[PDB]
Amino acid sequence: AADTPTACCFSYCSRQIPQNFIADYFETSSQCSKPGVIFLTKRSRQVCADPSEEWVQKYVSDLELSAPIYDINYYCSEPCQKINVKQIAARLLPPLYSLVFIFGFVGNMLVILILINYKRLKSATDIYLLNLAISDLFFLLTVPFWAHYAAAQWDFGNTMCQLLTGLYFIGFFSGIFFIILLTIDRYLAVVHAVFALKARTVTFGVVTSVITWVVAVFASLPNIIFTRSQKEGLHYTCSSHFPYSQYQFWKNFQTLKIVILGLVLPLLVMVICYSGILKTLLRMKKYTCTVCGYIYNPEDDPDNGVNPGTDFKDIPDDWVCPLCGVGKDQFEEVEEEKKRHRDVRLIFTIMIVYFLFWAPYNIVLLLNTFQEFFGLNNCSSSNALDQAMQVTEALGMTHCCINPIIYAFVGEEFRNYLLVFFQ
Ligand SMILES: [Zn+2]
C-alpha cells in the first residue's frame, strides 16, 4: 500500500480565491504532514488551501454538488511535487514485484499443500504454520496491483482500493500475530508443559486462529474505512484520508498500531521466549531412584557430601540414595524428553528473518512519527523520507516469498517429501 503522495501542502492560501477561477480540487494523502486541499485552476497550475476555513469547505461543497486570467501567486502557493519519489518507484519495483510474486505464490502453495497432505495438521503448531502461509498468500494476492499502481496509476476503482487495502493489512497483521503465536506455542511446549497439554490441541489452535483473524480485521477496520480512490489532476490514487479535526490523532494512532504490533510487541516476545527456552535447555537434570522413588534435585543434600551447584555427573560413584540406601547406579534421568518440542529452531529462524526484512520499515515509520521533532516537516526532507519509506516497504514486501525458502534451509520434512517423486 503506497500512500506515497503525488504532492503535499506545507503552506496555504492567504486570501479567498475567486470561486470562478477554480476548476477542480483534491484532498491530499494522509501520508502528508498536514491536512490539505489542492485547487486546480482555469490555468494548468495548482495551489494549496486549508480545509478548516468556511470558504474552502463551501467551495468544496459546491464543487461536489456540481460534479478569467489572474496571477494568484501574490497570495497562493504551489504544492511540494513528489517527482523523484514516483519516478524511482515506477522504474525499479515492477520487475522486483514480478519476481517475488512468482516465487512467493509457488513457495506458499507448496507449504500449504504439504502441511495438509504430508504433515497432516496434527497439532496447534501445524495450524499456525498453515494460517501463516495463508496470511502470506493474502498479501501476495495484492502484489500485482501494487506493482501496476507503482508503474502507472490506480485504475481498479474505489471498491478495489478498499478491499485490496483490507487484504493487504489483514495479511500484514495476521502474519505478525501468527509468528508471535508460533513463538509463544514453542515457549509453552518447552517451559510451561503445565498448560501446554491443553494449548497444543488442534481445537485450541482453531479457536485461537478464529479470534486472531477477527482481531486482524478490527486492526484493519480504520485502514479500510478511511481509504478510497480519488482523481488528482487526471491521475488516480489509492490512499487514506483523515478528517482534518482528528488528523494527527489518526496519523499517530495508525502508525503506532504498526510499530507497536509489528516491532515492539514481537521483539518482547522473542527476547522473553528465547531467554526462557535457553534457561530450560541449559538447566541441570533431575534423576530418580529406581527402587525408592526418591527424586534427586540438582539445585537442592545438606546432610551428604553433595554440592548444590552440581548435577548428577559430578557426584562420586560412592553416593547412596538418602531415602532408601542404594548406590548412584540405581538412578535414571527421570523420563524427561522434549518430544513436545518438535520445531523450535525453525520458528526462531522465521522470527529472526521477519525482523531482518521489516525492521528498516518500522524504524523509518518512527522517523516519520517524529518528523516534527527532526524538522523533516518540509518539501526537501519529505522526498528523502518518502523515498526511504518506498525502499524499506519494498524490502518488507519481499519477505512474503522467504518463509517457504526457510522451510527448506532449516526444515527437513519439507525436503524428504520431494524425494517421493524421484524414488
Ligand atoms: Zn532410593
Numbering used by the authors: -93 to -27, 8 to 223, 1001 to 1017, 1019 to 1054, 227 to 313
From the paper:
The complex protein was further optimized by introducing another six CCR5 mutations and inserting a rubredoxin fusion protein19 in the third intracellular loop (ICL3) of the receptor to improve the receptor stability and facilitate crystallization as suggested by previous structural studies of CCR5 and CCR916,20. Our functional data revealed limited effects of these mutations on receptor signaling with a wild-type level of MIP-1α potency (EC50) and 70–110% of maximum response (span), except for the mutation A2336.33D that forms a salt bridge with the intracellular tip of helix I to limit the conformational change of helix VI. The crystal structure of CCR5–MIP-1α was solved at 2.6 Å resolution. Our crystal structure of the CCR5–MIP-1α complex allowed observation of interactions between the chemokine and the distal N-terminal segment till residue P8 in CCR5, providing insights into the chemokine-receptor recognition. In the CCR5–MIP-1α structure three tyrosine residues in the receptor N terminus, Y10, Y14, and Y15, which are potentially sulfated and have been suggested to be essential for binding to positively charged residues on the binding surface of chemokines, are surrounded by four basic residues in MIP-1α including R17, K44, R45, and R47, with Y10 adjacent to K44 and R45 while Y14 and Y15 approaching R17 and R47.
CCR5 exerts its physiological functions by binding to multiple chemokines, such as macrophage inflammatory protein (MIP-1α, also known as CCL3) and RANTES (regulated on activation normal T cell expressed and secreted, also known as CCL5). Here we report three cryo-electron microscopy structures of Gi1 protein-coupled CCR5 in a ligand-free state and in complex with the chemokine MIP-1α or RANTES, as well as the crystal structure of MIP-1α-bound CCR5.
